[PDB]
Structure formats: C-alpha cells, structure tokens
Design a protein around this ligand. Sequence first.
Ligand SMILES: CC(C)(COP(=O)(O)OP(=O)(O)OC[C@H]1O[C@@H](n2cnc3c(N)ncnc32)[C@H](O)[C@@H]1OP(=O)(O)O)[C@@H](O)C(=O)NCCC(=O)NCCS
Ligand SMILES: CC(C)(COP(=O)(O)OP(=O)(O)OC[C@H]1O[C@@H](n2cnc3c(N)ncnc32)[C@H](O)[C@@H]1OP(=O)(O)O)[C@@H](O)C(=O)NCCC(=O)NCCS
Lengths: 179, 180
Amino acid sequence: MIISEFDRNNPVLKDQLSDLLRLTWPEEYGDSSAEEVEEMMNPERIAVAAVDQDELVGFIGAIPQYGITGWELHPLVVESSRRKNQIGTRLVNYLEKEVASRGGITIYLGTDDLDHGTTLSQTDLYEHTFDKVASIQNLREHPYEFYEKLGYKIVGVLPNANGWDKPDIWMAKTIIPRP
Amino acid sequence: MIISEFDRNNPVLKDQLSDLLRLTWPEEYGDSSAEEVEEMMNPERIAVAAVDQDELVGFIGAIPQYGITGWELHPLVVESSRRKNQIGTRLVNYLEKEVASRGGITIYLGTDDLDHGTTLSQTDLYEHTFDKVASIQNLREHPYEFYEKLGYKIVGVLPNANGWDKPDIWMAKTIIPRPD
Ligand SMILES: CC(C)(COP(=O)(O)OP(=O)(O)OC[C@H]1O[C@@H](n2cnc3c(N)ncnc32)[C@H](O)[C@@H]1OP(=O)(O)O)[C@@H](O)C(=O)NCCC(=O)NCCS
Ligand SMILES: CC(C)(COP(=O)(O)OP(=O)(O)OC[C@H]1O[C@@H](n2cnc3c(N)ncnc32)[C@H](O)[C@@H]1OP(=O)(O)O)[C@@H](O)C(=O)NCCC(=O)NCCS
C-alpha cells in the first residue's frame, strides 16, 4: 500500500489521525485531542502511516523509553472498515525494522482492558496473578491476541490501572537475534 | 524533620533537588536536571519533599498515567547519607495518602536492574518468565526489595529494556480497600 514515514507537517493528515483517535478511544482523546497528536510528532518518536491515495487508514508510533534500546509501541490504530486486512501487521512489521535500525532491542506496549474483553478483567488480579495471566482467554476480540500472533508475549499486568478490575496488559518482544 | 508538599515556589529547594538527582543519576540527570525538576513541578504530577531544618533530604514524585486511577511513582530519592533511616518509607506513605485523596487507586513503578542486582537480570526472561519473577532473589541490595517491604508487588518485567539482560522491573500496589 503506501505505508511510510508520517508527514508531521501535514495539518490534514494530523486532523485525520486526531479523528481516528477520537473515534477509537473517545474516553482518552477529547477536545484537546490535537495536543495528543502533537506529542506523537516529537522528534524522538517514530511516526508511520498507511495512507490510501489521501485517506489515512492506519497509524503506528513508537516512543524510545529506555535509552534507544527499549521502545514503547504507542499508539496503533486502523480505520474500522479496513481491519482484518493485514494493515496492522504491516504497520507493526514496518515499525520493528525501523526501531531495530535505530538501536532498539525490545518493543513493549500496554493494551488496556476496560471492556471486560479478556479474563484478566473483572477479577482481583492480586489473587493468583500469574495463574490468571497464563490462563488468559479472549472474550471480545481484545487486541492482545493480535500482538501474540505477531510474536509479542504478555510479560506483565497492572492491576486496577483504569479503575477496579480494569487492568493494563504489558506485552513485549525482542526484535533482533541475540548476538 | 517533616514530610509535606514540595513548595515549588522555592528556588533553593528546586536547586537542592536538581543536585540530589545529579548526584544519584548523573547519566539520567544533568543537562535537563535543572529542567526535569520542573517537569516534576507540573501541577498534574505530585511532588513531595522530606525536609530537615531546611535541607531537602528526600523527594518523591508521581505522574497520573491512567485517568485518575493509576499513578506512576517517579522519582524516589533519599540523600545517600540519610538512607536506611526510614525517610523513603515515610515518603511513600505520604505519596499514597496524596494519591488516594485525588481519587487514585493504584501506584506502580519501574525499577531497573542494570548491574545484576537481582536474579531477573542475566537470564532469558521470555523463558519461565513468571516462575523467575516469583522466585526473585536480591543479590546486591537492589531497591525492588525496598518496595516489596512497603507492600508493592512485582507484577511484570520488560526483557532487555536497557540492553541485553538488563530489564526494567514493574511493581504495583493498590492503595485503598478493595470494594466488597
Ligand atoms: C488491533 C488492530 C490494530 C489490528 O489491525 P488489523 O489490520 O485489523 O489486524 P491484521 O489484519 O494485521 O491481523 C493479523 C492477525 O491477527 C488477528 N487479529 C486482529 N485483530 C484482532 C483482535 N482484535 N482480536 C483477535 N485477533 C485479532 C487477525 O485475525 C489475524 O490473524 P491470522 O493471522 O490468524 O489470520 C486493529 O483491529 C485496530 O485498529 N483496532 C482498534 C484499536 C486497537 O485496539 N488498537 C490496538 C492498540 S493496543
Ligand atoms: C531505595 C531508597 C529510596 C529507600 O529509602 P530508605 O529511606 O533508605 O529506605 P528505608 O529506610 O525506608 O527502608 C525501609 C525498609 O526497606 C529496606 N531497604 C531499603 N533499601 C533497600 C535496598 N536497596 N535493598 C533491600 N532492602 C532495602 C530497609 O532495610 C528497611 O527494611 P527493614 O525494616 O527490614 O530494615 C534509597 O535507598 C535510595 O534513595 N536509593 C537510591 C535511589 C533508588 O534506587 N531509588 C529507587 C527508584 S527505582
């Protein structure tokens, strides 16, 4: 398709990105939505987009959080009408190569469960924490499974992150061969 | 000495803190040291100080990361000459009280293991990940144990975060009674 570095100076593409972020996570992106997008344009971050002739259909970003070795994959979104078509896979694949060329070793992410999309939510995660993580099941097509299919593994959970029994699920992947 | 909100309207204090970090994390603090002190001053974040006579001997901050429910504890520093005296303990307790008052529920943090300070470094954390987490041992007085004693629990690990076999260790605690 046309997956490449995002034009950080295109106010329109950024407006499109802003809308997509509002439509996908209205609880996190609101009026000041434009502010969140500008944060994603910061020079240290990677910003990549899937654009179709002029329409933004997907976006993925990465934040270097530990020197340049540890990067946080944030955010990742594909327009609803174009999902399940490998756009997300391509975006991730593209990101991993770029992160690796910058010196990255590990890409991690936090995928929240606010909608009881997995069995990790609606339960006291301090009781048998890791048995619950190991027996995780997908209840509402939660995206954690999307990442697992791409080689990411659940390496942690933040109990009650977004309110009681609405945890964040930490996943990670080492993107280069161990020398 | 007393523990209270960090008076951001004090240059001397900010300078005292700016140095406190330049003396604890010179690689992470220095150029932006007398700058990251202000990012900690942000009204969104929480800034707490341990002052003795007028000398800042401890500081703790927190960043709201998930709505108002989840907060990241960062940073936490006690002067090296005033450590192992419970200043840290008192800073954490006070921070927990502050977060709860703002409607917060959980406080988490990432304590890195850069120099084989715990059994979690120098091992492939992708293999038997959680058994390794559960059976962690402190090798060189790593600070994760400090947090454990204050009720925090290791809830995850970031394999190779700071370079091969130098992970970050995630710990968390819910600071108020669970609904029943
Ligand atoms: C999650 C998302 C980025 C995935 O992108 P996508 O292009 O739809 O995914 P792909 O088509 O590349 O899917 C690749 C594989 O993962 C699976 N998959 C994709 N989304 C999934 C989901 N939500 N739950 C379970 N499996 C999923 C696909 O079925 C496919 O499996 P297969 O290889 O066995 O056929 C996209 O659905 C999206 O934008 N969702 C809403 C926002 C979101 O949740 N973002 C994630 C940030 S934490
Ligand atoms: C870690 C730190 C914040 C703790 O502050 P402190 O005031 O020295 O700790 P306290 O005196 O409150 O200690 C309370 C308990 O924790 C223990 N403890 C403190 N630091 C410890 C360490 N590094 N390893 C193991 N146990 C430790 C104490 O032994 C005491 O336990 P006890 O009651 O059984 O004796 C302090 O040593 C410090 O400033 N360290 C350097 C900065 C740092 O690494 N911060 C952590 C952020 S990731």
